[PDB]
Design a binder for these strands. Structure first.
Lengths: 127, 150, 226, 91, 200, 25, 94, 96
RNA sequence: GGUGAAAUUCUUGGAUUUAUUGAAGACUAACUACUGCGAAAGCAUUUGCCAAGGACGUUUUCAUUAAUCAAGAACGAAAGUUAGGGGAUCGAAGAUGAUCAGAUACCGUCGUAGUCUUAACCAUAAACUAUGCCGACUAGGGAUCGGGUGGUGUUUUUUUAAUGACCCACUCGGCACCUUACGAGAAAUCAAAGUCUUUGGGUUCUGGGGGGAGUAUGGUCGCAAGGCUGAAACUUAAAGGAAUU
């Protein structure tokens, strides 16, 4: 009695992505992100901007017809961070508190099986 | 120890104090002597003759049962190999690595082992030539090594 | 960055969800509660149509939802859409994948990870690569806190795991294999066969991903969705 | 008596054509003029004829192979792959 | 005139009592007195001429026909081979990687000889002296020695002329150029040293 | 100076001396 | 002068190991030499589970936790206050 | 091993070397086992099997060449086929 | 997109993102440890083949064939060289974005050689355990790796035989570790760095204040880059080591 979707909350530094997706994965609804709500270019990944971004993703989905979604929070992955962004957990709370029920949270960050090389050199990002 | 390795493990045989043994033995000295040559007649090396006589028969060691040792008995009855047994196996191992190194040339570990085996063979050959067991002009030839093992 | 973009269009309105229609998904008869869900698709037009654009689709769901119970939550079943029947897309088994939460949970340290895989073709010509996992366990009364293996039992159990998976897959169809993984009877078979080598724990099959699909055979599909 | 210490076979060219080119032609000519053995008889009698042709004098069986080598490494790998594929498909 | 040795394989005519002699390019590992099984139902052996439509993927082939009934189109040089990539069941077509590195799609009824063309590694020894090059080119064609166009008169070559030895104009020549102006690089997309991958 | 940089400097200086050497000998 | 019996870190009888990369500044460090901290933190932040529970389909029971192993270089571990200096007597403490 | 067994036979029992001598032994029926290297001509091998089947003897294949067969026998030259006239003190006839 | 902050750069030609795949090369996480092997360098997916090695068990055999080493020889990280294949990430050079008084440095985006492999060279490192190899003796304690022994020991299949996996005790060889300091050391510290003024178990190599200088020249090896051997003139009263405030 409840149509379902997928959140795909991409959480990283300097940016955050909330892109609601249907069960199959081809359809795209409300790809709004946290970089089109802030006017600082430093708070794009901040928790204060993810909440604003997710406040619109939960309204467009409701207008479209989606009432509940699944959550797959992910990070940059690859060989760069492997850790969730500062505002990924805030984005999940924003659409949960907007009346959009959630369920089955999954971590789909791409962990490599020792592939390619990591940028920075052998002496590190000396700053 | 371990002439050609870094190991230091100690492991050997501890023969008993009784030079007249094992008391419960009942077979005669001649009976075990004809058993030694029978096993030597079928190509068994002196080490295998002692091994087989120790675990299958009641012969603890062939020195206290007989008056002489296994190699000594083999030479007396005319079943002595031309080349020493230990040298024979060392050359047999050496040609095995050479056969391995003639197809897989990129094996540097085998090359290092082959040098160690060849050096060990030369050192053993020097003693045997000095002790007047091998011909004074005997030498280890890589091409002829395979033929020497027969 | 709403006011930092300089070049927005180098070359020089209607909401797109009005031309999209809901389609209700269905699952094989292996899973009890079919009840998959709904998906968007562009309206059937004369140029591309909706069936062609919906023919190729793989929807990922969780086995706990399909079977109703909760002991299959860590297993998610991937179903591939391959044919429609007028507003109810029909799927088929495509793969099985252990969730990242569970997989990283059983993987601990001070224990040995035994892994194996097999490439086996079923009766219906479905070339499948089946993965399996196993972890050594600390037996009761043991005080040594490493519980490692000697790399020879690992090879022995790997051989037994490979032949067990080969036996239970060669001689059965994809539908039978799907009906076999859900009761987790394969895990019982492995723990019966590798209990005389090393205790082991958390015996599981990781992935049943698909490699080759046979001829379409719309007849089998109609039997799957009765 | 080691008439040439490094030049080896290509002392005919003398001081011409450059040391690097002389070294390369020496490396290839050693294998070109080397004597090989039949796989059908075992005697070391296989010798190079024309380009890619290796004919013998005892068994007289001629083999097609490399320009300067009786068996190219790439050819050997291709043969091994072909045998593996045949064994896989015919099983 | 060819660096690949030839093999004379003779067959039996199925319709008339007479021996047919065929000229095949010798492959590596092929020896005299060898039985060659040419056809569709043969085995995957070196020297066999099975069509590409009945071989497993990854097969190394030679003398590949572009079209059925061609009698040898591709992979006819020494040391060259064609790699099988895949096959399409419906509308039977085999995908092939050519020695150049260009992807090709051909029919499944194109016969190819299994193995690697003999004489591989032929171009690995410098010709050293001009005599070897002269002898090699005499058996091929009149294309040696070659005179540079920049050392010519302006009438005998577009690049010639002037008090110095310079081309004058750009060496790159457009594809849509008539006969006479095509002296240099023809439709050269890029010039200079090829550094890095070719992005094939 | 570091050992690496001192050795590199004297190696470049040795290269220059040998280049001057090759002109006369 | 010598500071620790294990000179770099935990390496006696091997001679060489495959190095790893720091997660912060991408510094190449030996696997033994690297200081590893395991993160068992839940997928959600502190608290906020009660907000999730009310808007949770099914009887909750999900509560996933993310698991990650982080390798830190000596410079980054000290700077991030993960690893702090100690007195000579406290240095010997494990 | 097969090499040790052949060496024991060469040392103790009666052996003959070559192809013509092997054919003569097969003809006279003084042969029991024949060992043919994997490098001999197929025609010669087939004729040897025909003689062996006519004379009711045993056939063994040495997984090498003439050089390897000669080395295993204990000779410097190349042996294509060895006929075993008498086992002697070995057991190559009864076993393998 | 990235940074402490920005910008270069990519974005109505749809960037970024999501879903179905395909191709290419590299790599062997998590399991991964005061853990194993190898002469060292070094070696982490699975399977098959090839030969090799340490330890253990042995009432098997030879018998002092041994230990250390000028000369000499094998292997020898990375980087570099020659000729092919390969060339995805990273990336000496180089091109730009900045920051800065200056920044051809640190930071950002591209990017050649290189990073992978085949065949042949290079013989270097903080190649360190800054501690040569062999042998003997000397304070205790626990854990752990491999093999062996014993205990109706526990668990396991058919409750109960075997075997396997564990518990306890012992033994041999190991990577090592904890506490003390007889003893040693200038001290930091050391189960050897102890058994050295109560000086002697066997053997090899190296050093005689700091610079000049591992430079110049002469030989020698190498395609080159460079390796081995290797001074003098001149100058200085100090450098250097461990700890205390």
């Amino acid at each position: 009695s409840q149509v379902f979707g997928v959140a795909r909350i991409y959480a990283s530094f300097n940016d955050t992505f909330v892109h609601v997706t249907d069960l199959s994965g081809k359809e795209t609804i409300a790809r709004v992100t946290g970089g089109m709500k802030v006017k600082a270019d430093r708070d794009e990944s901040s928790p204060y901007a993810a909440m604003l971004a997710a406040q619109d993703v939960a309204a467009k989905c409701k207008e479209v017809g989606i009432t509940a979604v699944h959550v797959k929070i992910r990070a940059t992955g690859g060989t760069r961070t492997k850790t969730p962004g500062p505002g990924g957990q805030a984005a999940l709370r924003a659409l949960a508190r907007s009346g959009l029920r959630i369920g089955r949270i999954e971590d789909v960050t791409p962990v490599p099986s020792d592939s390619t090389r990591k940028k920075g050199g052998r002496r590190g990002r000396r700053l | 120890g371990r002439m050609h390795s870094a190991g230091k493990g100690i492991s050997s045989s501890a023969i008993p104090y009784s030079r007249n043994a094992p008391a419960w033995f009942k077979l005669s000295s001649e009976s075990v002597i004809e058993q030694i040559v029978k096993y030597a007649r079928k190509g068994l090396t002196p080490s295998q003759i002692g091994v087989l006589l120790r675990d299958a028969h009641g012969v603890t060691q062939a020195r206290v049962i007989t008056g002489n040792k296994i190699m000594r008995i083999l030479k007396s009855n005319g079943l002595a190999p031309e080349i020493p047994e230990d040298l024979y196996y060392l050359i047999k191992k050496a040609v095995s690595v050479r056969k391995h190194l003639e197809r897989n040339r990129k094996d540097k570990d085998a090359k290092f082992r082959l040098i160690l085996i060849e050096s060990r063979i030369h050192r053993l050959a020097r003693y045997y030539r000095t002790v007047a067991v091998l011909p004074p002009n005997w030498k280890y030839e890589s091409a002829t090594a395979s033929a020497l093992v027969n | 960055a709403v006011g930092k973009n300089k070049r927005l269009s180098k070359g020089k309105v209607v909401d797109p969800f009005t031309r999209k229609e809901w389609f209700d998904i269905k699952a094989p008869s292996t899973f009890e509660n079919r009840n998959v869900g709904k998906t968007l698709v562009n309206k059937s037009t004369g140029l591309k149509s909706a069936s062609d654009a919906l023919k190729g689709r793989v929807v990922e769901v969780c086995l706990a939802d399909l079977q109703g119970s909760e002991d299959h939550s860590f297993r998610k079943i991937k179903l591939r859409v391959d044919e429609v029947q007028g507003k109810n897309l029909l799927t088929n088994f495509h793969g099985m994948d252990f969730t990242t939460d569970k997989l990283r949970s059983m993987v601990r340290k001070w224990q040995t990870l035994i892994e194996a895989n097999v490439t086996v073709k079923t009766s219906d010509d479905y070339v499948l690569r089946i993965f399996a996992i196993a972890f050594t366990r600390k037996q009761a009364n043991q005080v040594k806190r490493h519980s490692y293996a000697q790399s020879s039992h690992i090879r022995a159990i790997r051989k037994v795991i490979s032949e067990i998976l080969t036996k239970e897959v060669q001689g059965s169809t994809l539908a039978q294999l799907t009906s076999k993984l859900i009761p987790e009877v394969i895990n019982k078979e492995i723990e019966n066969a590798t209990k005389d080598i090393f205790p082991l724990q958390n015996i599981h099959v990781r992935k049943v991903k698909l490699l080759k699909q046979p001829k379409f055979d719309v007849g089998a599909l109609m039997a799957l969705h009765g | 008596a080691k008439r040439t210490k490094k030049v080896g076979i290509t002392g005919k060219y003398g001081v011409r054509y450059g040391s690097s080119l002389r070294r390369q032609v020496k490396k290839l000519e050693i294998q070109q003029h080397a004597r090989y053995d039949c796989s059908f008889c075992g005697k070391k009698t296989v010798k190079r004829g024309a380009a890619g042709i290796w004919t013998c004098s005892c068994c007289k069986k001629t083999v097609a192979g490399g320009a300067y080598t009786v068996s190219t490494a790439a050819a050997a790998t291709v043969r091994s792959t072909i045998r593996r594929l045949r064994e896989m498909v015919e099983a | 005139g060819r660096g690949a040795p030839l093999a004379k394989v003779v067959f039996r005519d199925p319709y008339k009592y007479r021996l047919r002699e065929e000229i095949f390019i010798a492959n590596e590992g092929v020896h005299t007195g060898q039985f060659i099984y040419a056809g569709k139902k043969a085995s995957l052996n070196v020297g066999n001429v099975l069509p590409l439509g009945s071989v497993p993927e990854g097969t190394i082939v030679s003398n590949v026909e572009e079209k059925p009934g061609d009698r040898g189109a591709l992979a006819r040089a020494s040391g060259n081979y064609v790699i099988i990539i895949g096959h399409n069941p419906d509308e039977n077509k085999t995908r092939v990687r050519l020695p150049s590195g260009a992807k090709k799609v051909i029919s499944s009824d194109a016969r190819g000889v299994i193995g690697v063309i003999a004489g591989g590694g032929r171009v690995d020894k410098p010709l050293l002296k001009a005599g070897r090059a002269f002898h090699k080119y005499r058996l091929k064609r009149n294309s040696w020695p070659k005179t540079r166009g920049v050392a010519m008169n302006p009438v005998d070559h577009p690049h010639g002329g002037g008090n110095h030895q310079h081309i004058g104009k750009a060496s790159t020549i457009s594809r849509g150029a008539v006969s006479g102006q095509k002296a240099g690089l023809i439709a050269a997309r890029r010039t200079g040293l090829l550094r890095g991958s070719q992005k094939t | 100076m570091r050992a690496k940089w001192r050795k590199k400097r004297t190696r470049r200086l040795k290269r220059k001396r040998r280049k001057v050497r090759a002109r006369s000998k | 002068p010598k500071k620790r019996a294990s000179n770099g870190r935990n390496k006696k009888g091997r001679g060489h190991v495959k190095p790893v990369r720091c997660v912060n500044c991408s510094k190449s460090i030996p696997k033994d030499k690297a200081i590893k901290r395991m993160a068992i933190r839940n997928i959600v932040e502190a608290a906020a589970v009660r907000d999730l529970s009310e808007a949770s389909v099914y009887p909750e029971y999900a509560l996933p936790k993310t698991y990650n192993k982080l390798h830190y270089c000596v410079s980054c571990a000290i700077h991030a206050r993960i690893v702090r200096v100690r007195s000579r007597e406290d240095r010997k403490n494990r | 091993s097969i090499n040790q067994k052949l060496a024991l036979v060469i040392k103790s029992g009666k052996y003959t070397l070559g192809y013509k001598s092997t054919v003569k032994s097969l003809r006279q029926g003084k042969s029991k086992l024949i060992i043919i290297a994997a490098n001999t001509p197929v025609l010669r091998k087939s004729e040897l099997e025909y003689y062996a089947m006519l004379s009711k003897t045993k056939v063994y294949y040495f997984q090498g060449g003439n050089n390897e067969l000669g080395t295993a026998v204990g000779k410097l030259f190349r042996v294509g086929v060895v006929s075993i006239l008498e086992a002697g003190d070995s057991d190559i006839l009864t076993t393998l």
